Amino acid sequence: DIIIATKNGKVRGMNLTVFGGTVTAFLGIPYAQPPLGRLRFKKPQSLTKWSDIWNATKYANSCCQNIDQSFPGFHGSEMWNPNTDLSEDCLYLNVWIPAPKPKNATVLIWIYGGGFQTGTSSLHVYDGKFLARVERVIVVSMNYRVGALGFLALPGNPEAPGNMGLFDQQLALQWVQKNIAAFGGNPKSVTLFGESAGAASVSLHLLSPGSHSLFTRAILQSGSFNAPWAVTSLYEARNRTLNLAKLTGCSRENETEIIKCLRNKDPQEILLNEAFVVPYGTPLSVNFGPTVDGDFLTDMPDILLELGQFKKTQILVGVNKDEGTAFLVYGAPGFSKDNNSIITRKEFQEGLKIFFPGVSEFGKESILFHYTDWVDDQRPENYREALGDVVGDYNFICPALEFTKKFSEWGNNAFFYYFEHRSSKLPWPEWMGVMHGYEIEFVFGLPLERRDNYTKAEEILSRSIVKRWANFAKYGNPNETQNNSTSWPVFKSTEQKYLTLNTESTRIMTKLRAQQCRFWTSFFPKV
Amino acid sequence: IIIATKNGKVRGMNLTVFGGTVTAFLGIPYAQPPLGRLRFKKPQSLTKWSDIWNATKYANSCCQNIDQSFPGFHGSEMWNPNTDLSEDCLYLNVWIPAPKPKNATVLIWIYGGGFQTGTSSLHVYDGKFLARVERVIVVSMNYRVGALGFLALPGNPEAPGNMGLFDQQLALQWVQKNIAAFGGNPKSVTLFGESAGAASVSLHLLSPGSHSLFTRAILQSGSFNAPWAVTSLYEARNRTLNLAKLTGCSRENETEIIKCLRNKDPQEILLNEAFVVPYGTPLSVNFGPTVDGDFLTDMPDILLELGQFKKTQILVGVNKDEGTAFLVYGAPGFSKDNNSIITRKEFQEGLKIFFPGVSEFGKESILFHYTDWVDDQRPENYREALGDVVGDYNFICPALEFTKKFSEWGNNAFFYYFEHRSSKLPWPEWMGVMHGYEIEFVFGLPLERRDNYTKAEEILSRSIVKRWANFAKYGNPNETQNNSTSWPVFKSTEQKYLTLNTESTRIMTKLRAQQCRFWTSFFPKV
Ligand SMILES: *[C@@H]1O[C@H](CO[C@@H]2O[C@@H](C)[C@@H](O)[C@@H](O)[C@@H]2O)[C@@H](O[C@@H]2O[C@H](CO)[C@@H](O)[C@H](O)[C@H]2NC(C)=O)[C@H](O)[C@H]1NC(C)=O
Ligand SMILES: *[C@@H]1O[C@H](CO[C@H]2O[C@@H](C)[C@@H](O)[C@@H](O)[C@@H]2O)[C@@H](O[C@@H]2O[C@H](CO)[C@@H](O)[C@H](O)[C@H]2NC(C)=O)[C@H](O)[C@H]1NC(C)=O
Ligand SMILES: *[C@@H]1O[C@H](CO[C@H]2O[C@@H](C)[C@@H](O)[C@@H](O)[C@@H]2O)[C@@H](O[C@@H]2O[C@H](CO)[C@@H](O)[C@H](O)[C@H]2NC(C)=O)[C@H](O)[C@H]1NC(C)=O
Ligand SMILES: *[C@@H]1O[C@H](CO[C@H]2O[C@@H](C)[C@@H](O)[C@@H](O)[C@@H]2O)[C@@H](O[C@@H]2O[C@H](CO)[C@@H](O)[C@H](O)[C@H]2NC(C)=O)[C@H](O)[C@H]1NC(C)=O
Ligand SMILES: *[C@@H]1O[C@H](CO[C@H]2O[C@@H](C)[C@@H](O)[C@@H](O)[C@@H]2O)[C@@H](O[C@@H]2O[C@H](CO)[C@@H](O)[C@H](O)[C@H]2NC(C)=O)[C@H](O)[C@H]1NC(C)=O
Ligand SMILES: *[C@@H]1O[C@H](CO)[C@@H](O[C@@H]2O[C@H](CO)[C@@H](O)[C@H](O)[C@H]2NC(C)=O)[C@H](O)[C@H]1NC(C)=O
Ligand SMILES: *[C@@H]1O[C@H](CO)[C@@H](O[C@H]2O[C@H](CO)[C@@H](O)[C@H](O)[C@H]2NC(C)=O)[C@H](O)[C@H]1NC(C)=O
Ligand SMILES: *[C@H]1O[C@H](CO)[C@@H](O[C@@H]2O[C@H](CO)[C@@H](O)[C@H](O)[C@H]2NC(C)=O)[C@H](O)[C@H]1NC(C)=O
Numbered sequence A: 001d002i003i004i005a006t007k008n009g010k011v012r013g014m015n016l017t018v019f020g021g022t023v024t025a026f027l028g029i030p031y032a033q034p035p036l037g038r039l040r041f042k043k044p045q046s047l048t049k050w051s052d053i054w055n056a057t058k059y060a061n062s063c064c065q066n067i068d069q070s071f072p073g074f075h076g077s078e079m080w081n082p083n084t085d086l087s088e089d090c091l092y093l094n095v096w097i098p099a100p101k102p103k104n105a106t107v108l109i110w111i112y113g114g115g116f117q118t119g120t121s122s123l124h125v126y127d128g129k130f131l132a133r134v135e136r137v138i139v140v141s142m143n144y145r146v147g148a149l150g151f152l153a154l155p156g157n158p159e160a161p162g163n164m165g166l167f168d169q170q171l172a173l174q175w176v177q178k179n180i181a182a183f184g185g186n187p188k189s190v191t192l193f194g195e196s197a198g199a200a201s202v203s204l205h206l207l208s209p210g211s212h213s214l215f216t217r218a219i220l221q222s223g224s225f226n227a228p229w230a231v232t233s234l235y236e237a238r239n240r241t242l243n244l245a246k247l248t249g250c251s252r253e254n255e256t257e258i259i260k261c262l263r264n265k266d267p268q269e270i271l272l273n274e275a276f277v278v279p280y281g282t283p284l285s286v287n288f289g290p291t292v293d294g295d296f297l298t299d300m301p302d303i304l305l306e307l308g309q310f311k312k313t314q315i316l317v318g319v320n321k322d323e324g325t326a327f328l329v330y331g332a333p334g335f336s337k338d339n340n341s342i343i344t345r346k347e348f349q350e351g352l353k354i355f356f357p358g359v360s361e362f363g364k365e366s367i368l369f370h371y372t373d374w375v376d377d378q379r380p381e382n383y384r385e386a387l388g389d390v391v392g393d394y395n396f397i398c399p400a401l402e403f404t405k406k407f408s409e410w411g412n413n414a415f416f417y418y419f420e421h422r423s424s425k426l427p428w429p430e431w432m433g434v435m436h437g438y439e440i441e442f443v444f445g446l447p448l449e450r451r452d453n454y455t456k457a458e459e460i461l462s463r464s465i466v467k468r469w470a471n472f473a474k475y476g477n478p479n480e481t482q483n484n485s486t487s488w489p490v491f492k493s494t495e496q497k498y499l500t501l502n503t504e505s506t507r508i509m510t511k512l513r514a515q516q517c518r519f520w521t522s523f524f525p526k527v
Numbered sequence B: 001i002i003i004a005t006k007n008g009k010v011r012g013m014n015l016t017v018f019g020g021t022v023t024a025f026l027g028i029p030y031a032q033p034p035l036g037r038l039r040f041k042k043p044q045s046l047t048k049w050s051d052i053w054n055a056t057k058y059a060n061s062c063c064q065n066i067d068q069s070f071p072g073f074h075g076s077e078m079w080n081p082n083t084d085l086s087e088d089c090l091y092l093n094v095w096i097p098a099p100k101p102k103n104a105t106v107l108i109w110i111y112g113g114g115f116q117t118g119t120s121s122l123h124v125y126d127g128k129f130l131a132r133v134e135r136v137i138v139v140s141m142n143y144r145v146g147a148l149g150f151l152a153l154p155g156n157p158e159a160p161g162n163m164g165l166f167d168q169q170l171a172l173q174w175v176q177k178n179i180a181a182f183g184g185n186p187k188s189v190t191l192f193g194e195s196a197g198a199a200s201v202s203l204h205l206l207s208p209g210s211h212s213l214f215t216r217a218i219l220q221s222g223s224f225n226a227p228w229a230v231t232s233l234y235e236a237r238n239r240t241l242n243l244a245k246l247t248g249c250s251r252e253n254e255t256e257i258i259k260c261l262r263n264k265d266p267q268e269i270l271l272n273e274a275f276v277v278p279y280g281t282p283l284s285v286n287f288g289p290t291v292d293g294d295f296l297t298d299m300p301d302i303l304l305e306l307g308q309f310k311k312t313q314i315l316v317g318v319n320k321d322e323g324t325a326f327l328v329y330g331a332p333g334f335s336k337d338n339n340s341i342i343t344r345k346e347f348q349e350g351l352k353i354f355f356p357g358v359s360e361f362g363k364e365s366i367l368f369h370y371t372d373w374v375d376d377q378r379p380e381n382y383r384e385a386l387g388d389v390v391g392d393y394n395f396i397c398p399a400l401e402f403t404k405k406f407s408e409w410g411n412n413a414f415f416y417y418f419e420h421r422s423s424k425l426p427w428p429e430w431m432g433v434m435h436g437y438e439i440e441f442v443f444g445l446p447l448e449r450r451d452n453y454t455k456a457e458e459i460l461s462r463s464i465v466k467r468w469a470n471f472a473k474y475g476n477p478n479e480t481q482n483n484s485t486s487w488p489v490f491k492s493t494e495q496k497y498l499t500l501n502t503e504s505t506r507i508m509t510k511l512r513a514q515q516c517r518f519w520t521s522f523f524p525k526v
């Protein structure tokens, strides 16, 4: 029998067959009291011992969230939708241990993304069994409250203070500290990693002192807190909370009466009103997300970073080549996943209105000008690809580069990557390229399964990315081998060297899209 | 020796140039003196004189303000007039090879000076070397500048505008009716000029009255589509009424304003021209060409797009550092006597001086486009960016635009880019290859070996002198020497041009295209 004794009771696990070996899996371990009833909108309360044996034998419920039904039956959009039942009772975590049991393994802890409104740790592409089997690490993931139930903010009021989902994550990190040694893990070798809003979450754990003692190193894939979508200002969050009360019939005089009212609404009557709390919303609007709660985050994050008040440790950071294209099919005129999406100069200007609703006409013109210095003005696809780059540069690439730059200047080793490979099984059209979220299966080893119709070069790439990630976790260095391997050099603010990742040639390059990012760092804020 | 003009007889003189002889006629009158009741009117054709005119000395230069910013400094005073000033100034010069030629091509020079200054008798416009070395006839003329040449009340023949342009046209007319008596071919005539003279040349390409008076055109550092080249009818009227206010000539109708301005001492007109525009820059053109309904029937850019101009070959070019000259006449931190290192805040202050009507957003976009440094460390970055802003906007990018549009009508265009800094240049090294300092090479001054030029400068000057004369004679700026690079036509697709310098003359494409894309496709939207 597969049984491990946690400090909240015993828990029973499960054996998995992975590449002629065994991976012991505990799926759905609870880490907090279910945020039901009077605990709705509050920080996670710690758990009390249970008598029996908890059966960590299946994935648990995913936290309440709206679903993406833009393309029913499409694997491209539905692979991100939750694959378990939805419930407010969702604060569970999973653990993958290599077999035979290790004596002191390094732990990788995964924070999924989803714009702080969607996501779940039980998706097929976050399966930690391959990492555990191939690299001998313990892999941990946790479900955390998303949407208004996770990030509703009446700042200073304990009944709904903001950043609950971030505290959800942090309490899972407290569990790993208190419990992972019992499974074979080293609490002193813990690496957080995550993608998109999960990468923004990872970078926020670097700033928050409460998290500092709970992990060793960080990996940020396609996200960081200085992204334009990551953090809501103190009082914009409160004003979206009030608009939600009004939208549900919960506008009261004192705040505790608003929260008391919101607690009697059904989850689905809250979810159906979240989209409306912001007046003109981009396809990248974070309705309810992190805020300066004065508890998890004591100041706006850009200030803490500039003043050097953050955890001093090594970071691995990177972005994909076409981060932006995924968002053009969700509201830009002339874009479909089913045609080649060739657009015109005015269809471009209307695309910019969708993504920059508050920017002036002079500002929207300067953007268009910076992205229209064609190398071949005969190329029809010019405007289709220019708009994807604008969305990609402004929202993901340039902030991640600027975060790495600023972080590197305080004396800790940073590494930057450019993921350039398109999946051979990607369900989306060609014109979208190396999309947001499509390095994850390569990081989690899914191409190592040959039963899965992957190309041999993709297995070699995935095997290489898996080794580099797990080595960065163990040693603070993302090396593959000492010989027959490109040395991945440190990102330094002068040279700004990064490593590209693809099947043809992994190269050391410099100053990724500097001419583009110079626009967003040095001209766009002045507009 | 004496030659018979259709209006009288003129006596010349013999010049010994490089062992040979050049026959010069300096100071032939081509129009009645625009005095008293002819002030502000178009030039009137001249009456015959019975005796002999002695065209043996440079004539009076037209009334104009003098640059006295740097007293005793050759770099500025070499552009000041070197004959006495007077409204009696409509004379011209003629240089002829010796022995007398047969049917020689004529090069007619039109000087610049912002339509405010200039004379044909400057040392750097000496046509004796051009005649000796290439056996061409060289003609230059004086034309009225300032308000005395370009005061405009549109529709009124007492002050119609463009009077200085008609001065030039009447000199071109003189050449058609007299250059044969001298040995020249009236049907082989090439206009060339620099700056305001180049812009003037390009305006003769548009005006129908001038079409039959020349064959080809050379445009050095200037063209009519430059921001400084043409005053709109509105600002021309606002500047004419301001001048009357400043001289006590504010009247109720136009005819009386002109009667009053005709009785003002020339210095009282000259010394008020500076105050007619409130927000001026070092490139301000107080009184210049306008849409007069006569010399220009429409706005020049409209004429250009529509193809209503003289179709012929053109030779067009610019220098590398066109903008520097103007940075020492207003921009803060700049001086001819130090290295003029400036800061980002001082760069923002220079922009305000050259773009006084532009929003802070627009001035920000200029700044941003010119600060993508190749080397972030070099302290000369902002000094080089400002002179590049002034040069690109005012000279380089208009001249490229002109050549593209002109050539698209089936005309052979040739574009050059002058990169040589004169070893004798009196201005500091940071100003580089300044506006106006290719003229010595076009006119053959470095061919005088007793002059402190370098050997390479003599070689370079001979190449340009040859290419220029060949373009006039044949329509192709080829050089006869075997080792010379072949000069291709400028066309809209490939946009090929020829660099000029001592080292090696290359052939390049799309000159400064990245900078000029700002000035054509984004700046008119701020
Ligand atoms: C705070 O937010 C309010 C939002 O009021 C709105 O009402 C909600 C119920 C929801 O329907 C939102 O989409 C609405 O925008 C801002 O209010 C603005 O001014 C009036 C006031 O009600 C509103 O009708 C306008 O639509 C809002 N303006 C815009 C441009 O949408 C308010 O400005 C925000 N800030 C502050 C300080 O209160
Ligand atoms: C050593 O192994 C290489 C594989 O490794 C490459 O891996 C990249 C991540 C990067 O670090 C790079 O510097 C490094 O060279 C083998 O080379 C490959 O060889 C096969 C043929 O067997 C080719 O089909 C592959 O395209 C090629 N991959 C390349 C060049 O990236 C090779 O087995 C071995 N080479 C030597 C010299 O020992
Ligand atoms: C332009 O105006 C001049 C003069 O303007 C005169 O207008 C009058 C109303 C009056 O206020 C007077 O003080 C002012 O000077 C005209 O010349 C004038 O012609 C009239 C004959 O009709 C004479 O009686 C005036 O003495 C004479 N004035 C002068 C100064 O000579 C002129 O005719 C007029 N022309 C046009 C086209 O408007
Ligand atoms: C058209 O001309 C008017 C008249 O302006 C004055 O400017 C002085 C320097 C001087 O030449 C004087 O003789 C002349 O009267 C211009 O008007 C001025 O505009 C500025 C704003 O830029 C105001 O501050 C002034 O008060 C105003 N003056 C007057 C008398 O109204 C006007 O700007 C000009 N327009 C154009 C497009 O050139
Ligand atoms: C070519 O240069 C010589 C002298 O070379 C330079 O020497 C410098 C110290 C300075 O004097 C500078 O002016 C000069 O250019 C010129 O010869 C001298 O010119 C001055 C007047 O400018 C006469 O007074 C001298 O007698 C004369 N000869 C000397 C000093 O030996 C010469 O004029 C010049 N040529 C041209 C065309 O500029
Ligand atoms: C990757 O690089 C690290 C160095 O950053 C290597 O680390 C050492 O690893 C061994 C275990 O094999 C330890 O016993 C040492 O104490 C480590 N030293 C340091 C300074 O980190 C690691 O072995 C390398 N891995 C590969 C596959 O080359
Ligand atoms: C697991 O590895 C850690 C080291 O990461 C071991 O801890 C020791 O070394 C730490 C730093 O290198 C220090 O904290 C201590 O020296 C020590 N840790 C203690 C005393 O808690 C840890 O013992 C290992 N556990 C095993 C091998 O079972
Ligand atoms: C799960 O699989 C593991 C390994 O495949 C089983 O446990 C091991 O079984 C092997 C062979 O029977 C023994 O040599 C090891 O000593 C066992 N390890 C431990 C820790 O017991 C285990 O029986 C399987 N679980 C089941 C069948 O429930």
Ligand SMILES: *[C@@H]1O[C@H](CO[C@@H]2O[C@@H](C)[C@@H](O)[C@@H](O)[C@@H]2O)[C@@H](O)[C@H](O)[C@H]1NC(C)=O
Binding pocket: A052, A053, A054, A055
């Ligand atoms: C967990 O499941 C228990 C029964 O499952 C089984 O019995 C044990 C002894 C093992 O043999 C296991 O493989 C079987 O599947 C329940 O009795 C128990 O109540 C469950 N736990 C909870 C918390 O409900």
Ligand SMILES: *[C@@H]1O[C@H](CO)[C@@H](O)[C@H](O)[C@H]1NC(C)=O
Binding pocket: B001, B014, B021, B098
């Ligand atoms: C130069 O001088 C005389 C002067 O009459 C002129 O006619 C002739 O061209 C020249 N003399 C020669 C060439 O002997």
Ligand SMILES: *[C@@H]1O[C@H](CO)[C@@H](O)[C@H](O)[C@H]1NC(C)=O
Binding pocket: B011, B054, B056
């Ligand atoms: C014409 O020029 C000659 C040349 O010296 C001179 O002798 C003669 O007096 C001049 N005639 C005039 C000025 O009438």
Ligand SMILES: *[C@@H]1O[C@H](CO)[C@@H](O)[C@H](O)[C@H]1NC(C)=O
Binding pocket: B103, B185, B187, B188
């Ligand atoms: C030269 O002059 C003659 C004189 O009649 C004229 O016919 C001819 O057209 C002119 N041009 C050339 C190129 O000969």
Ligand SMILES: *[C@@H]1O[C@H](CO)[C@@H](O)[C@H](O)[C@H]1NC(C)=O
Binding pocket: B333, B334, B335, B337, B338, B339, B340, B341, B342
């Ligand atoms: C250059 O000289 C000018 C005028 O004397 C002065 O205003 C400027 O500050 C000086 N700059 C430098 C760098 O010497």
Ligand SMILES: *[C@H]1O[C@H](CO)[C@@H](O)[C@H](O)[C@H]1NC(C)=O
Binding pocket: A334, A335, A336, A338, A339, A340, A341, A342
């Ligand atoms: C494809 O998407 C929609 C049609 O469903 C349309 O708006 C768009 O123009 C199409 N693209 C084409 C025809 O290129």
Ligand SMILES: *[C@H]1O[C@H](CO)[C@@H](O)[C@H](O)[C@H]1NC(C)=O
Binding pocket: B470, B474, B476, B478, B479, B480, B481
């Ligand atoms: C250039 O001059 C004319 C014009 O084409 C021509 O007769 C001559 O052969 C050309 N010479 C060279 C070297 O191109």
Ligand SMILES: [Cl-]
Binding pocket: A080, A113, A114, A115, A196, A437
């Ligand atoms: Cl996602």
Ligand SMILES: [Cl-]
Binding pocket: A340, A430, A431
């Ligand atoms: Cl395509």
Ligand SMILES: [Cl-]
Binding pocket: B112, B113, B114, B195, B436
């Ligand atoms: Cl000049």
Ligand SMILES: [Cl-]
Binding pocket: B227, B228, B229, B230, B231, B285
């Ligand atoms: Cl003007």
Ligand SMILES: [Cl-]
Binding pocket: B262, B263, B264, B265, B266
């Ligand atoms: Cl007078």
